[PDB]
Each structure stands twice: as C-alpha cells, then as structure tokens.
mmCIF file of C-alpha atoms in Angstrom:
data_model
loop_
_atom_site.group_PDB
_atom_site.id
_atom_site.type_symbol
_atom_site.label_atom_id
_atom_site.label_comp_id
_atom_site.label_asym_id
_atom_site.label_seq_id
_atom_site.Cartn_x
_atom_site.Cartn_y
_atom_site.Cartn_z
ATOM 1 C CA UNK L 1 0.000 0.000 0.000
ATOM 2 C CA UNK L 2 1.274 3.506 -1.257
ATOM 3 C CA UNK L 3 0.626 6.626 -1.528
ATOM 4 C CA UNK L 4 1.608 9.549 -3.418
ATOM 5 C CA UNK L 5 0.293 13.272 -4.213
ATOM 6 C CA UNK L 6 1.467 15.922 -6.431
ATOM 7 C CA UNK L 7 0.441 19.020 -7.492
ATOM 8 C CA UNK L 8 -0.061 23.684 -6.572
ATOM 9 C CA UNK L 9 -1.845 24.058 -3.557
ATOM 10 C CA UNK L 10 -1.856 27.927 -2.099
ATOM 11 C CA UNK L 11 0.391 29.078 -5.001
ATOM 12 C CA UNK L 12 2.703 26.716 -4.423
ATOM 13 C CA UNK L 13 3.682 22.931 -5.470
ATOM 14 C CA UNK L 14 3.648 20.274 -3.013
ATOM 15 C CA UNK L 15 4.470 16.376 -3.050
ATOM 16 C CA UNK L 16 3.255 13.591 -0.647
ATOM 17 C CA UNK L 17 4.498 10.529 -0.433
ATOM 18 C CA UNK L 18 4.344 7.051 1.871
ATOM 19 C CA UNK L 19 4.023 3.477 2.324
ATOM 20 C CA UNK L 20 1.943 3.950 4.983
ATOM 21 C CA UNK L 21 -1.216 5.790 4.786
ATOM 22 C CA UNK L 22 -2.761 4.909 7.615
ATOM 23 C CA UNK L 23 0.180 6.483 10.249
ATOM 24 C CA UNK L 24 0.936 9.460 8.079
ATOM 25 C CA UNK L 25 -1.322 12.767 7.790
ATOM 26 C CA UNK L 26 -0.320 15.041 5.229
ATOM 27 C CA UNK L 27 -2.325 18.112 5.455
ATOM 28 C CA UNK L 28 -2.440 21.315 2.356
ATOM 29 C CA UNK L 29 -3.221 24.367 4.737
ATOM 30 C CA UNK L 30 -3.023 27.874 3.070
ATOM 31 C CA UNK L 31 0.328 29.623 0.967
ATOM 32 C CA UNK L 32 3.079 27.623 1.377
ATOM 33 C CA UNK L 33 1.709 26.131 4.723
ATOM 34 C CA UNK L 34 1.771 22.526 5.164
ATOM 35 C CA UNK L 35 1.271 20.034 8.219
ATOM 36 C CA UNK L 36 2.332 16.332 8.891
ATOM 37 C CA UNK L 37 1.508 14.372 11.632
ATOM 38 C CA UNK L 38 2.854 10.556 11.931
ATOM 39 C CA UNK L 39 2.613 8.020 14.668
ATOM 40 C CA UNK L 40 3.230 4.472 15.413
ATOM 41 C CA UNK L 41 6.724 4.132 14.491
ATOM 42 C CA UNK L 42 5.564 2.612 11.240
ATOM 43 C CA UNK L 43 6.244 3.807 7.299
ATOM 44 C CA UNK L 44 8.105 6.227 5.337
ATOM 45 C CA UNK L 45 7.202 9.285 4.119
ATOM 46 C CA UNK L 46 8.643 12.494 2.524
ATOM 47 C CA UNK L 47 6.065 15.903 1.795
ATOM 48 C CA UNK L 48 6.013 19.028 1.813
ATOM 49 C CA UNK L 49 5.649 22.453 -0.417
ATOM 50 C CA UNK L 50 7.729 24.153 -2.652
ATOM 51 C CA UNK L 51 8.301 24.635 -6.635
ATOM 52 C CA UNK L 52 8.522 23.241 -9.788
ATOM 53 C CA UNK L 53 10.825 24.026 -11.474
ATOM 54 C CA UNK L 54 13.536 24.571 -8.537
ATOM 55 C CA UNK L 55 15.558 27.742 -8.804
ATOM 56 C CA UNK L 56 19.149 29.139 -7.255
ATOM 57 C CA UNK L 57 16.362 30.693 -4.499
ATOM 58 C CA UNK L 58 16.527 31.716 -1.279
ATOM 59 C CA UNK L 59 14.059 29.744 0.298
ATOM 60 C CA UNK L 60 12.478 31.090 3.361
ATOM 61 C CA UNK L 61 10.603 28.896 6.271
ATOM 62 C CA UNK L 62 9.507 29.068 9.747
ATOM 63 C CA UNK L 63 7.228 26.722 11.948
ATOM 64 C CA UNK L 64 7.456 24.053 14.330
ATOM 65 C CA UNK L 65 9.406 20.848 13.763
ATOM 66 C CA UNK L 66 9.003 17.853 16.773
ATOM 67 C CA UNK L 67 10.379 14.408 15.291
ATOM 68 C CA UNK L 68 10.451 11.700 17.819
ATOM 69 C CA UNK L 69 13.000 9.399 16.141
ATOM 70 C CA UNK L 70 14.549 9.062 12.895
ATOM 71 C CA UNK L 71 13.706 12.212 11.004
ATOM 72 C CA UNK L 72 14.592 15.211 8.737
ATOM 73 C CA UNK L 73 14.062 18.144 7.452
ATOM 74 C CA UNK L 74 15.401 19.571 4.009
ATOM 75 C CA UNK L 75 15.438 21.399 1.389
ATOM 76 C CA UNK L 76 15.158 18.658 -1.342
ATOM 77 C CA UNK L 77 14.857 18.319 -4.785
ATOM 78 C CA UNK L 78 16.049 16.946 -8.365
ATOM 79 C CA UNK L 79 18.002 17.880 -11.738
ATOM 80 C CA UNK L 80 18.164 16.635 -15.259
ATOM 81 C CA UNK L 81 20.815 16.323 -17.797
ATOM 82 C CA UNK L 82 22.205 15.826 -15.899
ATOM 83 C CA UNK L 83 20.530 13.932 -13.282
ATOM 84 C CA UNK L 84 20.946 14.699 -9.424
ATOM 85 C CA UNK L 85 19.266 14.559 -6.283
ATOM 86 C CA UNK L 86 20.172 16.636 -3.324
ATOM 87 C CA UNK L 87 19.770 17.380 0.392
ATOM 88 C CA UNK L 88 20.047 20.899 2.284
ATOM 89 C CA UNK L 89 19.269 19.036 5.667
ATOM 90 C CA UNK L 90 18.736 21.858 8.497
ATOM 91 C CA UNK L 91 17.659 19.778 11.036
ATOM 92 C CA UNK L 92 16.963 15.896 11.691
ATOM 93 C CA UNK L 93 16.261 13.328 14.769
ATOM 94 C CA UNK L 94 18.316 10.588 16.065
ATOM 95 C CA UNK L 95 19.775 9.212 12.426
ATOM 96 C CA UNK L 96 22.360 11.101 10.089
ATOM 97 C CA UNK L 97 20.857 10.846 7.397
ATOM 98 C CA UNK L 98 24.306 11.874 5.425
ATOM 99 C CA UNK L 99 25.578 8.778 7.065
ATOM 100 C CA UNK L 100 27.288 6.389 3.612
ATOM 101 C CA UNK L 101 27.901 9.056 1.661
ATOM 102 C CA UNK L 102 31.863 10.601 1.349
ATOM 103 C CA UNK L 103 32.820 13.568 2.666
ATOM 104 C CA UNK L 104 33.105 16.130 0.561
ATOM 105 C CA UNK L 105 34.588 19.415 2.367
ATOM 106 C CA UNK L 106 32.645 22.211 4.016
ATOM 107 C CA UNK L 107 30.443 25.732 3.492
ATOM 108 C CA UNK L 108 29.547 28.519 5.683
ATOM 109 C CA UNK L 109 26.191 29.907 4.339
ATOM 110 C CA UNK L 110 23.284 30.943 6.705
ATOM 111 C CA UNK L 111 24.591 31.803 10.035
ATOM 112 C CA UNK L 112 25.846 28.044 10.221
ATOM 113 C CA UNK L 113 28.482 25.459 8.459
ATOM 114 C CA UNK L 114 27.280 22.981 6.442
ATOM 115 C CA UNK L 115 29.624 20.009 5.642
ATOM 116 C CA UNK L 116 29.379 18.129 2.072
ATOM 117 C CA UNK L 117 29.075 14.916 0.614
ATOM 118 C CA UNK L 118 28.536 12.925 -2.455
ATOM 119 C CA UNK L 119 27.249 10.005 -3.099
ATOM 120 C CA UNK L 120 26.242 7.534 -6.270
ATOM 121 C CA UNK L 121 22.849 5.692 -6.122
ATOM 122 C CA UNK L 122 23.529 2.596 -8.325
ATOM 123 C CA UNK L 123 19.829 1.333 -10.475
ATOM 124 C CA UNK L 124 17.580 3.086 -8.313
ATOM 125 C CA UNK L 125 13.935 4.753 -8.339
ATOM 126 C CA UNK L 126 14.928 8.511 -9.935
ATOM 127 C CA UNK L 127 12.698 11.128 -11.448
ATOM 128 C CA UNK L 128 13.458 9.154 -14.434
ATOM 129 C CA UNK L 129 12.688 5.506 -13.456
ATOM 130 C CA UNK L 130 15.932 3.241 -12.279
ATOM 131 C CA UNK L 131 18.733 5.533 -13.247
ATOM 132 C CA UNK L 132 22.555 5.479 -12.142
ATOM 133 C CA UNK L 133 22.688 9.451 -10.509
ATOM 134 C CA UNK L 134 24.893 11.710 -8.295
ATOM 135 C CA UNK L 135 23.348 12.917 -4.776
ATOM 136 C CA UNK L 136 24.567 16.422 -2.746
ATOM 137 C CA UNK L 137 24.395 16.716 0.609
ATOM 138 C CA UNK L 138 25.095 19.472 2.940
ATOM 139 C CA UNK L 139 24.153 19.069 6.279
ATOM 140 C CA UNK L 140 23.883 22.017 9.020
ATOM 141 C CA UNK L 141 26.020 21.664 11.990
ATOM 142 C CA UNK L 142 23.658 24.111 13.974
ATOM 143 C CA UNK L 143 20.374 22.248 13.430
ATOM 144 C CA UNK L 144 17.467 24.964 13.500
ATOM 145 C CA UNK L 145 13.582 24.859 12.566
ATOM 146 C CA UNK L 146 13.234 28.362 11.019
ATOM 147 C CA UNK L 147 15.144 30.532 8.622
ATOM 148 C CA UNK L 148 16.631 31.395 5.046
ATOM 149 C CA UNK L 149 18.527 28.826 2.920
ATOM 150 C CA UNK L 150 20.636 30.118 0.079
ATOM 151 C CA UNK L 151 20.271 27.309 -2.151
ATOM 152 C CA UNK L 152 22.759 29.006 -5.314
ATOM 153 C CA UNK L 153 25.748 28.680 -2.067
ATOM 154 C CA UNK L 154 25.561 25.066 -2.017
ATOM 155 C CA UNK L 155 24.592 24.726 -5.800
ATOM 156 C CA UNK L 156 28.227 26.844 -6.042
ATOM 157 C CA UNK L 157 29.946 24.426 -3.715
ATOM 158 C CA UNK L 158 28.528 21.448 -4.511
ATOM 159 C CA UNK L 159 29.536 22.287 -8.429
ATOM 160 C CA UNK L 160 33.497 22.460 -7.908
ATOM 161 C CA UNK L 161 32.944 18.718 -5.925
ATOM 162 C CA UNK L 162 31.545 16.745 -9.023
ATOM 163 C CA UNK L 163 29.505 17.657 -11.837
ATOM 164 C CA UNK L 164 27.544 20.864 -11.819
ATOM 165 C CA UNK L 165 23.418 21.324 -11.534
ATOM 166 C CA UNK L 166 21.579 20.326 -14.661
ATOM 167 C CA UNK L 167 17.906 22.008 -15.348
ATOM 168 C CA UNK L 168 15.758 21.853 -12.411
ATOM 169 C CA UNK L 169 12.844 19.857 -11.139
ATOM 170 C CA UNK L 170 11.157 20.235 -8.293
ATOM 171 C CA UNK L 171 12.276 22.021 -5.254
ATOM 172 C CA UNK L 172 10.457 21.460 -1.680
ATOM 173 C CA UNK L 173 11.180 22.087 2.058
ATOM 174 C CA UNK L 174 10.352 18.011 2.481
ATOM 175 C CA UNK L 175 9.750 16.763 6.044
ATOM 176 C CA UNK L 176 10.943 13.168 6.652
ATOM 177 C CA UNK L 177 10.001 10.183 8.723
ATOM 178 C CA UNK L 178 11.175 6.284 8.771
ATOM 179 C CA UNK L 179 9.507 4.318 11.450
ATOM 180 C CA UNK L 180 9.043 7.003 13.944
ATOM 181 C CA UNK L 181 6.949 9.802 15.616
ATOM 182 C CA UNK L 182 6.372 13.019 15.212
ATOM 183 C CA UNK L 183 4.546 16.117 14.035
ATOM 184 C CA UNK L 184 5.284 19.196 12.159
ATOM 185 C CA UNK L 185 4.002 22.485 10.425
ATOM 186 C CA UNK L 186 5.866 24.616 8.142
ATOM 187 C CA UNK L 187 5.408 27.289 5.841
ATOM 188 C CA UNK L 188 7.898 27.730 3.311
ATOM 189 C CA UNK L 189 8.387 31.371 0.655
#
C-alpha cells in the first residue's frame, strides 16, 4: 500500500508521499503552509511544499518541527541532464541521514556550516525511473527549525565537488520520517 500526491496548492507545489497511509497525515493548509503528523513508528514518508521548477532561491521557512525518532528536514529536490538529487538538511532526529555518503569538504552559508558529501545511487527509483545518478548533501552543523537557505551557495559548492546542476525539477522544504513519531508544520516562501 502507497501513496503519493502531487500538485499547486496555495500558489505553491507540493508532493506527498508514503508506504503507509494509515500512520501518516499530510495536510495542504493555506500559501506555502503545510502540516504532517505521523505516529506508530511505522512507514516512510517524505512531503512538503515548494516549486517546480527549482531555482538558485533563497528559500524562506519558519514553523514548528518535533520528530520523535529518525527524522529530517530539508530542502530537497532533483536535476536533469544531468541527473541529481540533493539534500540541504537543516535539522533531523536521532539518524544522520548523510551517514554512507563521502565527505566532501565544508560551506559557511546561513549563520551556520554545512559540511558536504557525495554520493552515487547505483539502479535506483529517480525522477526518471531506475537511473545510475549523483546525490549532494550538505548538512547544518547548527540544526534549526526556522530561517533562510541560500540554495545558489551550495549549488556553487557542490559544483566544484563533481559535476555541476543540470535544469531543475522540483524544489520542496520536504519533512521526513522512517519508522518514527512526530509532528510538524511549516510554511515555506
């Protein structure tokens, strides 16, 4: 059983996704508003609001983050041609989630540094279907559940690492949960 939602709510576009519908609620609210409450410490999910197609944006959000467990929160989103997935995480539970990827230096953007890695996802669901792609990460050392992300800084970094951004997808402040608890509202700009 899965689950998955797409589409502009408030102005905005928003994705929704889980194995588990009957522990996750995703919930449109106004703008770029969104809430998601999980329980149960069962499924996966990833939602939230955003845009399609991404930009080098700064990305505003403030709200009220309480993961019980394994869980983050990110700016998240794809590019084609070529094709890459990547992570600004600003916040997460009691899991890493940059944790198997290589390091890949640091960046000092947003009142906080960020440290980088890479990583290569080998036949695996894409945008695309099973593709071979790169992933960025950059992961805040001063965890926080409200401010402005200058996503061109870690496009810039991330770009003299590997290769460089294609043409972008979609671009969302994603909350994240695997097998935990939690609830959250956010409202991204």
């Amino acid at each position: 059983r899965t689950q998955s939602s797409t589409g502009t709510h408030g102005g905005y576009y928003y994705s929704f996704w889980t194995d588990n519908p009957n522990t996750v609620t995703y919930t449109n609210q106004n703008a770029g508003q969104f809430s998601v409450s999980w329980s149960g410490n069962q499924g996966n999910f990833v939602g939230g609001k955003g845009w399609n197609p991404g930009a080098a944006r700064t990305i505003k959000y403030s709200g009220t983050y309480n993961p019980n467990g394994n869980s983050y929160l990110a700016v998240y989103g794809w590019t084609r041609n070529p094709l890459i997935e990547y992570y600004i995480v600003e916040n997460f539970g009691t899991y890493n989630p940059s944790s198997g990827a290589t390091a890949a230096g640091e960046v000092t953007v947003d009142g906080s540094v960020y440290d980088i890695y890479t990583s290569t996802r080998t036949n695996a669901p894409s945008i695309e279907g099973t593709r071979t792609f790169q992933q960025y990460w950059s992961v805040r050392r001063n965890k926080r559940s409200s401010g402005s992300v200058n996503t061109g800084a870690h496009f810039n970094a991330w770009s003299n690492v590997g290769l460089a951004l294609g043409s972008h997808d979609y671009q969302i402040l994603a909350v994240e949960g695997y097998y935990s608890s939690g609830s959250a509202t956010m409202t991204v700009s």
